Design a protein around this nucleic acid. Structure first.
Lengths: 1341, 366, 251, 50
RNA sequence: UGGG
């Protein structure tokens, strides 16, 4: 335990205090999981290639009876690896093999085929592959794609907030949104009528859209309403009783029931009389006539004598109609309830809005009402109805639409057809009215349970589907006139829409951009990101208010801390450490089951809807040995709230406390002691850190750095470890142990470490061996460390000794002062790498050769150039020196003696060729690293291109011969065994070459078996390794693909060193970013009683205002951190015995209460104690978890172990006057960071640059020499001062005056200092732009 | 950070900078007429900056009214020094004379030889020295540092230039050979025209106006689409048909070339000559040789019944006169007889001009 | 502005002219042809939409390009900039001699002075440098003095010291609100890549030092130096014209 | 092209004082009409004026 | 994407 083979070198101290149930996962897995979902064979139809294949296929031409049947698919092996394909600048992809067969139906026969043709498929498209590090390599780029955040398809009931007409009326609408196709919306107007909006068109009533569903008015009222039974016959005039349906009522007359009084006139409507009359059983009783005039007939009743009828529905009656309907002979007439308390009259007004009760008519008004164009032909109405409404291809809800659709309606089935049925939208309408009736709740938009994310797999599947349908459109047309086509699955498929669709999506998009190469943490947080943008998207500006606010469902899924500030606030987010994604695309978070009074160790992942109903315990809570709670009242959360609950009322447990913080902010110790916004800045500034020469371990830390560094994929992870054989800077090999081995071929592990290589930000990356020799390796090891990594631990910055005071007022506001010692020690130094390219192209005048130095240039620049005009490796190029020369011929020379005389003295070219060359720009100084030049097939390479081929061939042969050497090593071992078995000549047997001629015949069995088998193995391994070496050599040298117009490409790399300077722009992880005002010498820095000056000094003024207590705690805990290491170092200066050092180390690690760290000495025997001591000589890596920290008692005790003053303050003396400062001073060690922002590129100071051809103004860009900008508020200010000439020179002469330039400059050279203003050209531009219009403007004399 | 469509904007190209001599004269402290005379001088400066017109033509073109040549001459010599080591003055002597005046003003054997070599006998000493070594009185290799110093003396101007217009062909039309057939596959093909029509079709139904705009927005757009997609498809089909006709009709790999009347290639597709000959003007061809769909359509009767036009003859004639003259024949008629021995029926009178043409040293190589 | 990669590039507003002239030549060629009235009415409508789309892009047909889509631009949007005067005129000009560096703060350089980087120098003052090089007789031709500046001889540093001594240089920040955001100070050459600003004046800029950049301008001629020295000197004006309570007060 | 946008003749000469079809190159010829077209000599800054 |  607690080994890992790295950790035995250096131990971290953890304060613990709470256990961790589950380990941190791979944490990139979900990303790869998406890729793992895109490529696989799924018979069930899961999202991937098979879903699009079964979606588009089978395909058939119209009335041609020809079908195509696709069967599965297959993927081939890439032509290159990651390294070589990244170096050559070629995209990294894989071939696509998807088989399909052609079937020709029989002519003029039912359900028959004359012949079927199954042949091999044609090569189409290229599908890239996601690297093990999680990047998509295209054109030599990292190209990390960010996941998308959007709303899930389904039904959304919205209250809209109820403010529309200002009259204070609530309006409940709803939106059914499918996955693809037209969106359907239902809305209420203040008129209290139902209206329908289809694809944001004009508002139409809900009756005209339902009328096309073949529901008659009687079926509409009978289906969508509950009619009360009423019958008036023989003057009785009685109705049925509705005690439960009728609550409140107004009685205008006495109501008696079965001869007994029931409700008196003006009687109380309270539940007393309702229950009194409800207890007794009363049949239908008579009522007065006045109650009928308020009722409305539901169904359509006709007289039995004659055929005519009265209207349809939604029409009241009169006292004169009772004679007609009573004389007609109708015994019973069903009428709707006509009672408004919770319910109310609806849909009646909508019936009154439109005349059309019929499918044909309503189809006409919906057709012509939608499309402004050609009126309906009665074909277009049905074609747009069936095509735009539910259909197989156009309308698909699939799993999210059907699942959320059935869940919103409380339906039992979780699946169904991909299209809506007739009763589905009717149910949406019934519940939709039920929301207005007062029953039900309004779903929130910001609620995450309805908010779904997508990944690269589903989007790439969508684009591949769009391309495959785009081809499917063209395939159907060629099958009609094709008749019999030999080898049909060959030329009938074009790969241009496929490779162009997927190559266009991966190549260019707003969700696919360059990965940040600075630090591994910026890579991890770059690969894990949430964005509301994308194809459905939320673009910007709009929809940005409530949505940006924090919602309680964001607790254990997205980190509230990390987010950019000004533009993107509330949009970009970061997932939690333990957060994962469901198969359906929903985020869940784990919990810990609690049964009875004990807490079970099993975990259960819950979603928002699942966790909302149950109760989850608070993060920090005590525990017992059996798992019982110490306190009865436990803080918990039920629904959207928090409060105390009983020990038996809590369902689950929060497990770890870090579930609410992402990986970037998980490296901030004592997060509770810093402000929320300042920690938001601290997590942002730590991602911009630039790596340096040597990474120093942080004294104050967390312990998440290990999983971040090993899971970032930057370092070298050792697989199937074993005894190390050979080590080296660029190569490390390991001999695998015999325990885990694959039978046959033997072989050992080889590792090629990545040397200095250009970045996207121009920085450098490197790897160095962490092991020496003769030590084993366990699986899951770290062989090398990438940039800003130390022994597998992630150190992205360098510690310093902080002193808090002002020093002679040199620190002002947030600024900082640095000692010269930091500059002398080389700390805070970075290296950049710049790529330079020169192209040679074939023009109209013929090819452009690169050779024969440069014309019209002295030998000064020619001495540095050779090998066809390229610089040597290791040369230092400064200034405007030409790195690569080039000659472009010009053949326009004709005749006259001046040409012959010009060619007499000089000859050769005689100035017929231009001097254009690479021409390295100024402001760049450094040496050369690598020559990347690419050449063309059959262009007769020559030059130096053969040297790199000899290097690659020598390397491939050198590292290739090792495995073979092992092959005949073991082979000669076995042959040695069989020759020693009998007739052993001892050393003489090894002295004779060629296996001593196979030891003659020896025994007969070995002569017919062992000898021929041994020679067969020798010839097989020999010729096999020679064949593989020849194929590899043929693989090294290959013609590089390039454009038909380009001839040859030259690329050379440069390196530049950058040292710390007053430009500064440093930062901490607590949100503190200063600048360097002055660099003081060591003599001027304050020193303690021992004479040790402080390295860095900060201003305390920012501590109370910015509310950062983690800084000071980091300084004191840094003192207690380094003091112990100084004790071990002081003990090692005297070469103390292993016993005393063992007692001091063991006494050092076991301190503190609890901390649940059981690591202890008296285990490692002899050495490895002195190794870890020599490792911790510099300092002790104390690790502090995020939400579990240390305390003042632990800091003071651990500090008193180092004999340091408990108050954390030490006396200091002045470095100049030497006087003692009044009051003590807090000293410490804080972790310091450098930022990519430097004054090297931020200084310009333009004098006279190039001018634009339009408006005669300078440009704005640096390098191309921008003149910055002079704005409107500046003219406002200069008008506030009242200076006419100071602004007058800047408005005209310095900008828009053509003659003011030359004449002004001429007056300045002579020293006249005369203005002589002139007329601006931009005003003339405005003049002409107005003159183009019919408006005339003219100056006056 | 891609900013959607990207800048894609007019941009106001800032390069220009053909001649800065105007900005140089603008800073020269002239009085009154010297500025106008200087502007008259700088206008006649050639792009090469070696020999510019005639000194008398300037003065005759000034509209003198006195202002004799003694002034404008001092303006010449005056600007030539402020020039980048020199400009114009022609004569081919004044360039090297001014370049050596302010360069050094000392070294071993600079001015002593430079004055006589620059003054006279230069053109006589350009080919070889020989007897001139006895005229200059120098002994053996003493002049090696002199002429060696002149070699570095060097077109006098053309230092600034700054002409980014390199004029590249790029793609255009391509052909390929394989499986025993060197047949072009029309190896361009953006497909944008094809793609745009397909893509634009989606665009027509995307107005989202509610005005329908069936009369103007819908029919006109459709017409434009038919009009541009049909025109691009017809142009691409004509270019592919002409590229295939010229491909199959003549083979580049085979030695020599076959003359094609404009009519034979026009008679293959049965199209008028002007239509195809106009298509072959600005359209080039890219194969794995050289770098035009115009030089491969050269027509000539070759003036013989036994065989090809002039391209084959011209290449052959330069391949003949290339290696020849072991001694110093310096002969064109002998090349016309050797060419006549193959049955080409060369006149041998106009043969030299053809042979001489296009950088050939003949007949001045004698 | 033809590009070598894209051959001849055409502006979005250029196609409107060839479109209106195209439909105009169609209407004129088809007019005298003596054709039915429906076709010539359709031609009048197409030309009407063409001219109306040329003058005003917004509303109406809002014609869309095939390749780049977008509404493109018409004369109404091409007036100036944003369809204001702001971008290319009315204080939209970039002038010259501007800023672009970081600001620092020393506890020296009296309140009328500011540290000017010596590398930031030698460039803004090039006209003065050439003037004094031609005045003192150390050179003759302008190109010779240009080579002397490019070779940065030690004498050029002394002459530059003579130039910068009393020559004022005015400072301004990027989001200037009140008038005190832009002032005029006396430069003093300092060794470094940044500018040292007086601390007490920083409160007038309402900024802090995180490494913020700045804007710098150099007045030319003469009267501009008198308007900078007599007005924008922070030693000349203290009381802010808002409260009347003093500013630059230490903190 | 003649009679077109930014055409020669009207709107001014394209390059320096040169004229079409190689006539009246520079300098002493100012007021004049070219043989083939109405091209005249100008500083070429008139492109904005016309 | 990022800085005030």
């Amino acid at each position: 335990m607690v080994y890992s083979y790295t950790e035995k070198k250096r131990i971290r101290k953890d304060f613990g205090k709470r256990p961790q149930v589950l380990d941190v996962p791979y944490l990139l897995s979900i990303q790869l999981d998406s890729f793992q979902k895109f490529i696989e064979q799924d018979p069930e139809g899961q999202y991937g290639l098979e879903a699009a294949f079964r979606s588009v296929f089978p395909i058939q031409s119209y009335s041609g009876n020809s079908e195509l049947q696709y069967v599965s698919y297959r993927l081939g092996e890439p032509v290159f690896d990651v390294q070589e394909c990244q170096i050559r600048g070629v995209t990294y992809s894989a071939p696509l093999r998807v088989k399909l067969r052609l079937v020709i139906y029989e002519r003029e026969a039912p359900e028959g085929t004359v012949k079927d043709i199954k042949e091999q498929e044609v090569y189409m498209g290229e599908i890239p592959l996601m690297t093990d590090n999680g990047t998509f390599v295209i054109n030599g780029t990292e190209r990390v794609i960010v996941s998308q955040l959007h709303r899930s398809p389904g039904v959304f009931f919205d209250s809209d907030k109820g403010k529309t007409h200002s009259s204070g009326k609530v309006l409940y609408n709803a939106r059914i949104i499918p996955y693809r196709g037209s969106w359907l919306d239902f809305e209420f107007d203040p008129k209290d009528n139902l209206f329908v909006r289809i694809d944001r068109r004009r508002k139409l009533p809900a009756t005209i859209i339902l009328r096309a569903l073949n529901y008659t008015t009687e079926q509409i009222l009978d289906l969508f309403f509950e009619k009360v039974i009423f019958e008036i016959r023989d003057n009785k005039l009685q109705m049925e009783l509705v005690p439960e349906r009728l609550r409140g009522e107004t009685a205008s007359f006495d109501i008696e029931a079965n001869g007994k009084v029931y409700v008196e006139k003006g009687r109380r409507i309270t539940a007393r009389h309702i229950r009194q009359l409800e207890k007794d059983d009363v049949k239908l009783i008579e009522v007065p006539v006045e109650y009928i005039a308020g009722k409305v007939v539901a169904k359509d009743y006709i007289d039995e004598s004659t055929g005519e009828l009265i209207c349809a529905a939604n029409m009241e009656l009169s006292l004169d109609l009772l004679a007609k309907l009573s004389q007609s002979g109708h015994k019973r007439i069903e009428t709707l309830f006509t009672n408004d308390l919770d319910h109310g009259p609806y849909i009646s007004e909508t019936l009154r809005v439109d005349p059309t009760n019929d499918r044909l008519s309503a189809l006409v008004e919906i057709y012509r009402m939608m499309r402004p164009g050609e009126p309906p032909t009665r074909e277009a109405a049905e074609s747009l109805f069936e095509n735009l409404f539910f259909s197989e291809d156009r309308y698909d809800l699939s799993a999210v639409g059907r699942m959320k659709f059935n869940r919103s309606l409380l339906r039992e089935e979780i699946e169904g057809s991909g299209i809506l049925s007739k009763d589905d939208i009717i149910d949406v309408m019934k519940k939709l009215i039920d929301i207005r009736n007062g029953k039900g709740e309004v779903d929130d938009i910001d609620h995450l349970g309805n908010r779904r994310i997508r990944s690269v797999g589903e989007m790439a599947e969508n684009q591949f589907r769009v391309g495959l349908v785009r081809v499917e459109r063209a395939v159907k047309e060629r099958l009609s006139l094709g008749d019999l086509d030999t080898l049909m699955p060959q030329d009938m498929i074009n790969a241009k829409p496929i490779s162009a669709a997927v190559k266009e999506f991966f190549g260019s998009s707003q969700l696919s951009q360059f990965m940040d190469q600075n630090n591994p943490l910026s890579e991890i947080t770059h690969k894990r990101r949430i964005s509301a943008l994308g194809p459905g998207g939320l673009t910007r500006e709009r929809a940005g208010f409530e949505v940006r606010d924090v919602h309680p469902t964001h607790y254990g899924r997205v980190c509230p801390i990390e987010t950019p500030e000004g533009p993107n606030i509330g949009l970009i987010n970061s997932l939690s450490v333990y957060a994962q994604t469901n198969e359906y695309g929903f985020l869940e978070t784990p919990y810990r089951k609690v049964t009875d009074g004990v807490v079970t160790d099993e975990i259960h992942y819950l979603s928002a809807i699942e966790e909302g109903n149950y109760v989850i315990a608070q993060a920090n809570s005590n525990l017992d040995e059996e798992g019982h709670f110490v306190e009865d009242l436990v803080t918990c959360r039920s629904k959207g709230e928090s409060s105390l609950f009983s020990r038996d009322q809590v369902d689950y447990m929060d497990v770890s406390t870090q579930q609410v913080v992402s990986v970037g902010a998980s490296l901030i110790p004592f997060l509770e002691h810093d402000d929320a916004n300042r920690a938001l800045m601290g997590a942002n500034m730590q991602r911009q850190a630039v790596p340096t020469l040597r990474a120093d371990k942080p004294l104050v830390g967390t312990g998440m750095e290990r999983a971040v560094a090993v899971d970032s994929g930057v370092t070298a992870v050792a697989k199937r470890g074993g005894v190390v054989q050979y080590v080296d800077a660029s190569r490390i090999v390991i001999k695998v142990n015999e325990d885990e081995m694959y039978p046959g071929e033997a072989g050992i592990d080889i590792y090629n470490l990545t040397k200095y290589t250009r970045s996207n930000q121009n920085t450098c990356i490197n790897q160095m061996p962490c092991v020496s020799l003769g030590e084993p390796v366990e699986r899951g090891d770290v062989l090398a460390d990438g940039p800003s990594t130390d022994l597998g631990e992630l150190a992205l910055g360098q510690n310093m000794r902080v002193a808090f005071m002002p020093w002679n007022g040199y620190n002002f506001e947030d600024s900082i002062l640095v000692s010269e010692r930091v500059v002398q020690e080389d700390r805070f130094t970075t290296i950049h790498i710049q790529e330079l390219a020169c192209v040679s192209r074939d023009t109209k005048l013929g090819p452009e050769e690169i050779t024969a130095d440069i014309p019209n240039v002295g030998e000064a620049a020619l001495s540095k150039l050779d090998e066809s005009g390229i610089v040597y490796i290791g040369a230092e190029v400064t200034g405007g020196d030409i790195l690569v020369g080039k000659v472009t011929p010009k053949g326009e020379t004709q005749l006259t003696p001046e040409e012959k005389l010009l060619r007499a003295i000089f000859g050769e070219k005689a100035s017929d060729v231009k001097d254009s060359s690479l021409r390295v720009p100024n402001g760049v100084s450094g040496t050369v690293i690598d020559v990347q030049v690419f050449t063309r097939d059959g262009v007769e390479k020559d030059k130096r291109a053969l040297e790199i081929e000899e290097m690659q061939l020598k390397q491939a042969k050198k590292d290739l011969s090792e495995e073979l050497q092992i092959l005949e090593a073991g082979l000669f071992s076995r042959i040695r065994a069989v020759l020693v078995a009998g007739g052993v000549e001892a050393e003489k047997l090894d002295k004779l070459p060629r296996d001593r001629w196979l030891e003659l015949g020896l025994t007969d069995e070995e002569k017919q078996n062992q000898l021929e088998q041994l020679a067969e193995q020798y010839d097989e391994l020999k010729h096999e390794f020679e064949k593989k070496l020849e194929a590899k050599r043929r693989k090294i040298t290959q013609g590089d693909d390039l454009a038909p117009g380009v001839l040859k490409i030259v690329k050379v790399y440069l390196a530049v060193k950058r040292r710390i300077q007053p430009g500064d722009k440093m930062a901490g992880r607590h949100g503190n970013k200063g600048v360097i005002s002055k660099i003081n010498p060591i003599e001027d820095m304050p020193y303690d009683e021992n004479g040790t000056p402080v390295d860095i000094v900060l201003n305390p003024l920012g501590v109370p205002s910015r509310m950062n207590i983690g800084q000071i705690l980091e300084t004191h805990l840094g003192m207690a951190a380094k003091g112990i290491g100084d004790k071990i170092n002081a003990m090692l200066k005297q070469q103390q015995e292993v016993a005393k050092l063992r007692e001091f180390i063991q006494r050092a690690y076991d301190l503190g209460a609890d901390v649940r760290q059981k690591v202890d000495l008296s285990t490692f025997s002899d050495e490895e104690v002195m190794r870890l001591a020599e490792n911790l000589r510099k300092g002790m890596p104390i690790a502090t978890p995020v939400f579990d920290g240390a305390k003042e008692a632990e800091i003071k005790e651990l500090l008193k172990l180092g004999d340091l003053p408990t108050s954390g303050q030490i006396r200091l003396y002045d470095g100049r006057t030497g006087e003692q400062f009044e009051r003590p001073v807090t000293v410490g060690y804080m972790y310091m960071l450098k930022l990519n922002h430097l004054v090297d590129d931020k200084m310009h100071a333009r004098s006279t640059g190039s001018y634009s051809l339009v408006t005669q103004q300078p440009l704005g860009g640096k390098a191309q020499f921008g003149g910055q900008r002079f704005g409107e508020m500046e003219v406002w200010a200069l008008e506030a001062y009242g200076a006419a000439y100071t602004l007058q020179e800047m408005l005209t002469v310095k900008s828009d005056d053509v003659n003011g330039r030359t004449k002004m400059y001429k007056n300045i050279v002579d020293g006249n200092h005369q203005m002589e203003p002139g007329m601006p050209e931009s005003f003339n531009v405005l003049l002409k732009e107005i003159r183009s219009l019919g408006i005339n403007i003219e100056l006056e004399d | 950070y891609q900013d959607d469509e990207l800048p894609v904007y007019q941009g106001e190209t800032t390069q220009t900078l053909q001649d800065y001599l105007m900005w140089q004269v603008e800073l020269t402290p002239f009085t009154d007429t010297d500025r106008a005379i200087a502007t008259s001088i700088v206008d006649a400066v050639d792009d090469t900056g070696y020999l510019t017109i005639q000194i008398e033509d300037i003065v005759d073109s000034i509209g003198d009214d006195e202002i004799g040549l003694e002034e404008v001459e001092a303006v010449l010599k005056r600007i030539q020094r402020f020039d980048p080591v020199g400009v114009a003055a022609k004569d081919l002597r004044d360039c090297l004379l001014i370049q050596l005046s302010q360069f050094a003003k000392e070294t071993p054997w600079l001015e002593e030889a430079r004055l006589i070599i620059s003054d006279h006998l230069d053109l006589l000493a350009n080919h070889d020295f020989r007897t001139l070594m006895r005229v200059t009185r120098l002994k053996e290799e003493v002049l090696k540092e002199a002429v060696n110093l002149i070699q570095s003396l060097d077109x006098x101007x053309x230092x600034x230039x700054x002409x980014x217009x390199x004029x590249x062909x790029x793609x255009x039309x391509x052909x390929x050979x394989x499986x025993x057939x060197x047949x072009x596959x029309x190896x361009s093909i953006p497909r944008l025209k094809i793609n745009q029509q397909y893509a634009a079709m989606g665009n027509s139904a995307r107005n989202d106006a509610d005005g329908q705009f069936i009369r103007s927005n819908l029919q006109e757009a459709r017409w434009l689409i038919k009009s541009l997609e049909s025109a691009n498809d017809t142009l691409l089909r004509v270019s592919r048909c002409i590229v295939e006709q010229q491909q199959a009709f003549f083979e580049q790999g085979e030695e020599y070339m076959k003359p094609m009347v404009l009519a034979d290639i026009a008679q293959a597709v049965e199209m008028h000559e002007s239509t195809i000959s106009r298509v072959t003007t600005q359209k080039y061809l890219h194969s794995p040789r050289g770098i035009x769909x115009x030089x491969x359509x050269x027509x000539x009767x070759x003036x013989x019944x036994x065989x090809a036009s002039s391209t084959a003859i011209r290449a052959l004639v330069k391949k003949l006169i290339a290696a020849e003259n072991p001694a110093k024949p310096l002969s064109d008629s002998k090349l016309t007889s050797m060419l006549s021995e193959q049955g080409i029926m060369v006149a041998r009178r106009t043969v030299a001009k053809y042979r001489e043409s296009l950088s050939i040293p003949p007949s001045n190589q004698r | 502005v033809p590009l070598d990669g894209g051959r001849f590039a055409t502006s979005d507003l250029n196609d409107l002219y060839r479109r209106v002239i195209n439909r105009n030549n169609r209407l004129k060629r088809l007019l005298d042809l003596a054709a039915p009235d429906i076709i010539v009415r359709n031609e009048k409508r197409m030309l009407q939409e063409a001219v109306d789309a040329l003058l005003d892009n917004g509303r109406r047909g809002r014609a869309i390009t095939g390749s780049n889509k977008r509404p493109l631009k018409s004369l109404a949007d091409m007036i100036k900039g944003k369809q204001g005067r702001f971008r290319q005129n009315l204080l939209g000009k970039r002038v010259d001699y501007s800023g672009r560096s970081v600001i620092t703060v020393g506890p020296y350089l009296r309140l009328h002075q500011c540290g000017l980087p010596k590398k930031m120098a030698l460039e803004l003052f090039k006209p003065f440098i050439y003037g004094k090089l031609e005045l003192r007789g150390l050179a003759t031709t302008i190109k010779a003095a240009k080579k002397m500046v490019e070779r940065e001889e030690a004498v050029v540093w002394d002459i530059l010291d003579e130039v910068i001594r009393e020559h004022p240089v005015l400072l301004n920040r990027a989001p200037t609100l009140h008038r005190l955001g832009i002032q005029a100070f006396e430069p003093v050459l300092i060794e470094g890549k940044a500018i040292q600003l007086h601390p007490l004046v920083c409160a007038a800029y309402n900024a802090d030092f995180d490494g913020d950049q700045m804007a710098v301008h150099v007045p030319l001629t003469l009267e501009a130096q008198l308007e900078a020295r007599a007005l924008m000197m922070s030693t000349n004006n203290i009381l802010s014209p808002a409260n009347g309570e003093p500013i630059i007060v230490p903190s | 092209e003649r009679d077109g946008l930014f055409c020669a003749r009207i709107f001014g000469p394209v390059k320096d004082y040169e004229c079409l079809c190689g006539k009246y190159k520079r300098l002493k010829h100012r007021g004049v009409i070219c043989e083939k077209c109405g091209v005249e000599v100008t500083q070429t800054k008139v492109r904005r004026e016309r």
